[PDB]
Amino acid sequence: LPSTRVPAGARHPIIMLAEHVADTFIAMGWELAEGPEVETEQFNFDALNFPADHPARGEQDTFYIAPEDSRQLLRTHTSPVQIRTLLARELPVYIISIGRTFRTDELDATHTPIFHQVEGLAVDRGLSMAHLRGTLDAFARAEFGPSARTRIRPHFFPFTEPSAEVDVWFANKIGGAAWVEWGGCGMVHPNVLRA
Amino acid sequence: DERLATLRAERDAAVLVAEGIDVTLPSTRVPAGARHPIIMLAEHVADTFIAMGWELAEGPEVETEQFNFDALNFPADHPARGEQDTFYIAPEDSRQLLRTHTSPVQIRTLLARELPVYIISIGRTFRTDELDATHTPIFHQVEGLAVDRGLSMAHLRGTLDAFARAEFGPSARTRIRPHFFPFTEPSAEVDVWFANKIGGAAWVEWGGCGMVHPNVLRATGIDPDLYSGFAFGMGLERTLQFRNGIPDMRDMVEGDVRFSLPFGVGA
Amino acid sequence: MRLPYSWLREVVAVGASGWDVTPGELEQTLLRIGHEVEEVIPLGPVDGPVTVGRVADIEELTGYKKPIRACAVDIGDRQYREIICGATNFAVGDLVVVALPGATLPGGFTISARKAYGRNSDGMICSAAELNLGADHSGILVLPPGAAEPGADGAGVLGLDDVVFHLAITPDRGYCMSVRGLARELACAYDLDFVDPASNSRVPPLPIEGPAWPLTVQPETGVRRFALRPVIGIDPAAVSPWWLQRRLLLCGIRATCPAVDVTNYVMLELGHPMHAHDRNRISGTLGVRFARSGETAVTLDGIERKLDTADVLIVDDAATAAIGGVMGAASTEVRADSTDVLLEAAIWDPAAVSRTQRRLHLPSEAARRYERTVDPAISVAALDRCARLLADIAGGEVSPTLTDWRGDPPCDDWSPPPIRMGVDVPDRIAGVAYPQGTTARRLAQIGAVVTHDGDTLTVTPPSWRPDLRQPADLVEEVLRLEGLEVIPSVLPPAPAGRGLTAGQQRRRTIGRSLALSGYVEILPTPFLPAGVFDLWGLEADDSRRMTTRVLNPLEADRPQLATTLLPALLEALVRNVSRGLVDVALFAIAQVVQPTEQTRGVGLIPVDRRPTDDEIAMLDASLPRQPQHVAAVLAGLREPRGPWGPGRPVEAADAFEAVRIIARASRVDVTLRPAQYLPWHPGRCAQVFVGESSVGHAGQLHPAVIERSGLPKGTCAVELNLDAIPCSAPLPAPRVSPYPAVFQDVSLVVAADIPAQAVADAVRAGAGDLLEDIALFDVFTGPQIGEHRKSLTFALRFRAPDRTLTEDDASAARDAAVQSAAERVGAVLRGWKLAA
Amino acid sequence: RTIGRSLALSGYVEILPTPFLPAGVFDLWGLEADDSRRMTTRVLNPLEADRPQLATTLLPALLEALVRNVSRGLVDVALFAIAQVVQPTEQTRGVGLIPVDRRPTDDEIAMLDASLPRQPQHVAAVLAGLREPRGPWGPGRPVEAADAFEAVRIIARASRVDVTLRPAQ
Numbered sequence A: 001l002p003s004t005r006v007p008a009g010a011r012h013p014i015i016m017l018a019e020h021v022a023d024t025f026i027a028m029g030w031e032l033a034e035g036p037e038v039e040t041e042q043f044n045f046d047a048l049n050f051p052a053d054h055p056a057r058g059e060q061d062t063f064y065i066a067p068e069d070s071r072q073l074l075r076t077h078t079s080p081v082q083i084r085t086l087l088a089r090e091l092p093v094y095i096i097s098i099g100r101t102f103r104t105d106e107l108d109a110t111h112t113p114i115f116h117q118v119e120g121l122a123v124d125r126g127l128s129m130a131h132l133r134g135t136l137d138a139f140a141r142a143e144f145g146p147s148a149r150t151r152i153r154p155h156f157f158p159f160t161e162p163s164a165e166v167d168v169w170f171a172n173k174i175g176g177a178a179w180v181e182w183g184g185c186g187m188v189h190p191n192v193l194r195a
Numbered sequence B: 001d002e003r004l005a006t007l008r009a010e011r012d013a014a015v016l017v018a019e020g021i022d023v024t025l026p027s028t029r030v031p032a033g034a035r036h037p038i039i040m041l042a043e044h045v046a047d048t049f050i051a052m053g054w055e056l057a058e059g060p061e062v063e064t065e066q067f068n069f070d071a072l073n074f075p076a077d078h079p080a081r082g083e084q085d086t087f088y089i090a091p092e093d094s095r096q097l098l099r100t101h102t103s104p105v106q107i108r109t110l111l112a113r114e115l116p117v118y119i120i121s122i123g124r125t126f127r128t129d130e131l132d133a134t135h136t137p138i139f140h141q142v143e144g145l146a147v148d149r150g151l152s153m154a155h156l157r158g159t160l161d162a163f164a165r166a167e168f169g170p171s172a173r174t175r176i177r178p179h180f181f182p183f184t185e186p187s188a189e190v191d192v193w194f195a196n197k198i199g200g201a202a203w204v205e206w207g208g209c210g211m212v213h214p215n216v217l218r219a220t221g222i223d224p225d226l227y228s229g230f231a232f233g234m235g236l237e238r239t240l241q242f243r244n245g246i247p248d249m250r251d252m253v254e255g256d257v258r259f260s261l262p263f264g265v266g267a
Numbered sequence C: 001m002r003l004p005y006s007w008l009r010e011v012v013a014v015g016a017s018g019w020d021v022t023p024g025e026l027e028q029t030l031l032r033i034g035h036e037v038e039e040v041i042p043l044g045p046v047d048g049p050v051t052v053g054r055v056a057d058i059e060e061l062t063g064y065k066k067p068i069r070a071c072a073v074d075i076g077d078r079q080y081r082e083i084i085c086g087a088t089n090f091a092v093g094d095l096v097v098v099a100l101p102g103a104t105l106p107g108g109f110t111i112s113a114r115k116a117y118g119r120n121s122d123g124m125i126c127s128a129a130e131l132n133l134g135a136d137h138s139g140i141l142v143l144p145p146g147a148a149e150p151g152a153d154g155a156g157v158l159g160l161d162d163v164v165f166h167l168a169i170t171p172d173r174g175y176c177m178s179v180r181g182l183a184r185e186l187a188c189a190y191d192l193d194f195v196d197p198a199s200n201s202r203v204p205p206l207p208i209e210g211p212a213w214p215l216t217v218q219p220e221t222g223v224r225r226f227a228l229r230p231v232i233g234i235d236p237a238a239v240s241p242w243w244l245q246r247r248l249l250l251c252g253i254r255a256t257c258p259a260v261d262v263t264n265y266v267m268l269e270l271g272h273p274m275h276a277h278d279r280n281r282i283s284g285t286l287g288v289r290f291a292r293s294g295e296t297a298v299t300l301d302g303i304e305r306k307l308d309t310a311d312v313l314i315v316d317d318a319a320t321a322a323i324g325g326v327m328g329a330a331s332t333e334v335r336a337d338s339t340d341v342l343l344e345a346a347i348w349d350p351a352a353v354s355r356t357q358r359r360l361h362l363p364s365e366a367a368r369r370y371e372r373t374v375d376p377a378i379s380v381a382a383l384d385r386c387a388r389l390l391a392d393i394a395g396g397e398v399s400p401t402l403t404d405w406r407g408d409p410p411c412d413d414w415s416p417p418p419i420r421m422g423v424d425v426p427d428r429i430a431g432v433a434y435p436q437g438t439t440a441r442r443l444a445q446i447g448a449v450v451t452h453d454g455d456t457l458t459v460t461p462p463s464w465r466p467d468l469r470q471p472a473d474l475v476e477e478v479l480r481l482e483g484l485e486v487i488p489s490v491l492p493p494a495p496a497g498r499g500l501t502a503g504q505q506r507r508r509t510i511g512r513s514l515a516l517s518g519y520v521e522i523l524p525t526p527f528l529p530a531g532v533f534d535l536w537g538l539e540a541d542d543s544r545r546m547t548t549r550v551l552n553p554l555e556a557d558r559p560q561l562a563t564t565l566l567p568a569l570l571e572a573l574v575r576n577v578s579r580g581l582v583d584v585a586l587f588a589i590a591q592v593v594q595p596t597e598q599t600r601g602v603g604l605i606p607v608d609r610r611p612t613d614d615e616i617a618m619l620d621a622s623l624p625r626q627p628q629h630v631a632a633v634l635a636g637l638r639e640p641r642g643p644w645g646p647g648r649p650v651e652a653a654d655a656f657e658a659v660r661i662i663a664r665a666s667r668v669d670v671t672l673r674p675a676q677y678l679p680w681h682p683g684r685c686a687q688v689f690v691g692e693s694s695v696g697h698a699g700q701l702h703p704a705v706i707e708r709s710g711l712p713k714g715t716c717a718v719e720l721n722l723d724a725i726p727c728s729a730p731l732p733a734p735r736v737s738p739y740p741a742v743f744q745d746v747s748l749v750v751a752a753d754i755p756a757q758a759v760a761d762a763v764r765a766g767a768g769d770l771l772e773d774i775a776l777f778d779v780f781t782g783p784q785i786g787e788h789r790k791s792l793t794f795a796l797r798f799r800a801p802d803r804t805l806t807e808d809d810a811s812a813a814r815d816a817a818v819q820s821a822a823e824r825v826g827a828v829l830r831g832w833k834l835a836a
Numbered sequence D: 001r002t003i004g005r006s007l008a009l010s011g012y013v014e015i016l017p018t019p020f021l022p023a024g025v026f027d028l029w030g031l032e033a034d035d036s037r038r039m040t041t042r043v044l045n046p047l048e049a050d051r052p053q054l055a056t057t058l059l060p061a062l063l064e065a066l067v068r069n070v071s072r073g074l075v076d077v078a079l080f081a082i083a084q085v086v087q088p089t090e091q092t093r094g095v096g097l098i099p100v101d102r103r104p105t106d107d108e109i110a111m112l113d114a115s116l117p118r119q120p121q122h123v124a125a126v127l128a129g130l131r132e133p134r135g136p137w138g139p140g141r142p143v144e145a146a147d148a149f150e151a152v153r154i155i156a157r158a159s160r161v162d163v164t165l166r167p168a169q
């Protein structure tokens, strides 16, 4: 006979994924950072080497806070949290930040305007792309199995130089292992370090 | 009909007061439980070391004499064994026993894994002490082992100090002063500076540490000229007793729900 | 940016003759060095009779919906076939492309002699799409006269063995949006000699013998170079040769007339956009100036643009010639009768073009190249290349006059500043030991001037590379050309971390605890529903209405950010209920947005330094308060129906219990106090206190709010402010007495209005340390005790720390407890008992 | 950890079980003579001479803590434990000393492992008294067998596996 008179609930699967990601990086000595979702343009763009008149901003991708020219917005990624952490802490800094982020995409089967992002930042003496790849590979093993790894191939972001797009080798399934575009990475741009 | 709506509302607002409730009544029909406070302390200790890149190891509580004594540089005829402190498995001269500390788990981990090894092990352990307010025959221990190239007492102290900050506050640190254990050389006893309380900060004897003895490194196939190791151990019931001010360890082990409930669920 | 492999191969082949690679290898090489390949399109294959035809006769078929044509087509060797076609963009005498019976078109279509519209059709006349030659447009393909004789092989005339590469160029590589730039990139990748198609050996300079038109330039417009040259007496009826119309079609441009086609061709070839003015339609001096407030221009497409005082125009005495860098205007547009052409080779300000085109929604081929900076060094070369080609095609002369405004004072040297970088810096950043002389060889290939001074190179990038401007920029060039795959995977040592914070650990515990108790977490949306606070009946000055507002929301009536998580929670509840899931408990842990003053933005702080503590404090203070909330909603059955019984509907007590779950999870003690607070019910609403600080509310929703909102009858809700719940890290040391307890039950009569917890507190206060536990059993009302009184029966468990309690010792403790309830809440003892 | 958080939220209190069985507990249970639970490993110098057998089941220790709570007036109790048992396979076979001037070979380790009793991890719980307490809602609900079945389902949900229950003696 059924015995469950207090039916079980569920934490959200995104939240649990974030939880698993956070535990993965904690277990490597990193720390979690958090910050506001309504953020200053200073931290969300200008400190990230991404000025007013650069090709693109929020004519097409950012929610802006009223009124026009208030330099407030809903953050479009969690980097401003990383930027706050760099101001507030002593170096070296090894930091994961996971949070709600906002883009002006219509909700369909493969896009959501309200989404959740994970970002990492390692700032130390002597860090290289080699270290970037090791972190990315550890992260992929945690979320995709011991057979997983990453490849990087050049791209462009204003806050990194070199910049690359990250593909993950998803072995465990997909109905037959294939590369899948995962996210993006790069070495922190010197203008971000000065700011 | 300004006054029609007025009183047609006033009677509608009193229908709402008519159906009021005492919002202070008890609501908890599924009373909360509690994970055990030792278990939660172990959990907090384990999380502290995980967050530093270390890993947890586990092993059996009935263990071979090989791993619990002989690999730990602690032979048959050394001054002491289990004439006086170890539970032995029958029959006499079967080389089985209840483990007296979790080091054999560390020993198994060194056989089974590649170096470097950074390892916490937390488990039930057994000593022939009568149960009184400050001793329990069934207790829970935490031990650490770092084996790498170039490790020193300096690293031992840094780990011990991080551990103390985690369990005792940012004002805490440790001191070490020489002692002796068969599996370490140098050996030391660890005191923790318990600032946050005790009714006025004082040093409290926490546990013991040392550099892993070379005979232990050989008995696990490690070349003591390339690798060095440190290790430490603290008793959880001991730590809980003096941190929380718990005068009677019988309350830790007897299973009275009144002892656990005030510690919360542990979720 | 689309371009075809043959053209790209031809340009690369000048300096490395015989070069050739498969599409696959080309795709891979392009990705490996940084260029996203969106699609590889080989030109759809044809088999059999697909040949050039000439339309020898047209007969308009009448009596059908659309205009239909029976055509006699000369298909070669004096054979004439009758063919039905529905297009209209061709006349008698036109070369077309016919697929004849037995032919197979891309997509696996076999052509067969059908009967259609009352006549026999021996095949069809093809569109560029039906042949997978180029974009589908209205009408069939028409080849320019003299491209091929009727009967020529379609596949060879059309060049269908070609492949088009569709790329997504990154905004830092504007130089790559042309055959010039991509060809250079391939010569770098493949270690080839490169002959620059914009250089003088490949574009010999035309003569320079006086100005080509009067020109005034307001230099604060950001124009960097502005060149004009004329071509006079061109045939207004000439068409572009097939090879040129083809290359434009494979690149996504529809050819129109040689004046336009030649500027689009040189744009694709060299990356410098061009424009052709009908010179006879210019009136007087050409002026480059900002626009005035309210000004208008009508562009080539005949659409009136509202201008902006930051837009740079080209005007003459009469009207506007161009929205500079974006699009030419109608007034100087080349048109059917244009015989004398003035060719514009300008270099505009990137930020200026960017602002103007985004504002007007004109992301033209020109604008997109100017946004990303066009090579100023090649303006005249692109001008001369363009003039020669126009004259050659449509037959005029190139006048030897030339304007070439190059700044004030004239800039003669377009090279960026030199960059100093250590020779091994790319080796460090990549974590690879590159062969010696690698960084300097690769920087040479990309056209920079490299000089060695011990361990420190000086690198002067080329003019088409305005992106190369710090040592980091140069590292990316080395690393991408060597390949990123050679970089090893090396875990860094990260230091001893401190793990998760208290607040982070608390939000996990709150979620595990609510989820076990049966709540389902949702991701709330921060955009409030339209008019939700009017539905709640909130007052006008209720703090929850002071919302921060988004300025470009995806729904125009939902622009307010949430000051409360209940709107989103109630929205997910409504969705579950409307899908038949009627017994639901949902929760959310998320931040709200509560602004304090008006939207005060802080001005830009220089990013060449870090902001000062004061500047950070000022930025923080300018943002709204954004505390973390936890909230939940419940409707339907709390306990489901089953063998045990019918189940239990949600009541306000279940929301109170949700407070107690959150509080147990937070290891703090709460008190609940009666309160009136929309959207809750006034007699079933509790305000929650930790100590004396309000942390939120819980209870049943107001039935009027439920009704106006379409909510389930009886919906309950809870919202707490997590920032107001202080941290606690208790270190308990419970006294656990083993001596026997004494159980007594006491019933107290009190005023109906007195809260039960008040009576319990009073009983506990007077009973002292002997009272181990108190618990409310019964709440009884009835006439015999008072119409406004109520009887509360409490179960008391007493226990001594050092001894067995005598029963008189317990009754003394009870008497003290009863006296305390008398003194504090006016309680009257009704009876007691020795709980058996 | 998840099993413990899940049982504790559902109202169970964890105990640290003792591995030394009560004297004659299996005679009190009426177990047959050949019941596997009676094949116990035995300590040779126990602190109580009549409790030398190591536990093949966690219920004896759980029932012991229950009895203690009930005897102190705490009569509505749900307790649980997560701990290892000791289940020996052959007789107490010790392995001879291996030289400690080298590491033991994989075969020697395998032989040491095989010489020790099976020591699997168990989870167990006991309940008595009221499952739901008495209060304004009603008289409360005494513990029934269904509450132990629900404890299986809590553990299984916590383990993310599906269980089936079948009648058994």
Ligand SMILES: O=C(Nc1cccc(S(=O)(=O)NCCc2c[nH]c3ccccc23)c1)Nc1nccs1
Pocket: A056, A076, A077, A079, A080, A082, A083, A119, A120, A121, A156, A157, A158, A159, A160, A183, A184, A185, A186, A188, A189, A192
């Ligand atoms: O560099 C940091 N993070 C990082 C780096 C590389 C990729 C990513 S990404 O995968 O999130 N992709 C983002 C793409 C994107 C968002 N907006 C854009 C606008 C224009 C163009 C591209 C984008 C995150 N963080 C730092 N914190 C402090 C110093 S650097």
Ligand SMILES: O=C(Nc1cccc(S(=O)(=O)NCCc2c[nH]c3ccccc23)c1)Nc1nccs1
Pocket: B080, B100, B101, B103, B104, B106, B107, B143, B144, B145, B180, B181, B182, B183, B184, B207, B208, B209, B210, B212, B213, B216, B231, B232, B233, B234
């Ligand atoms: O060295 C390790 N741990 C360690 C080291 C120092 C102290 C401690 S302790 O604080 O637990 N105190 C124990 C005291 C003690 C127990 N029995 C004795 C018999 C005679 C004398 C003293 C004792 C633990 N572990 C390793 N694993 C692999 C290689 S070394």
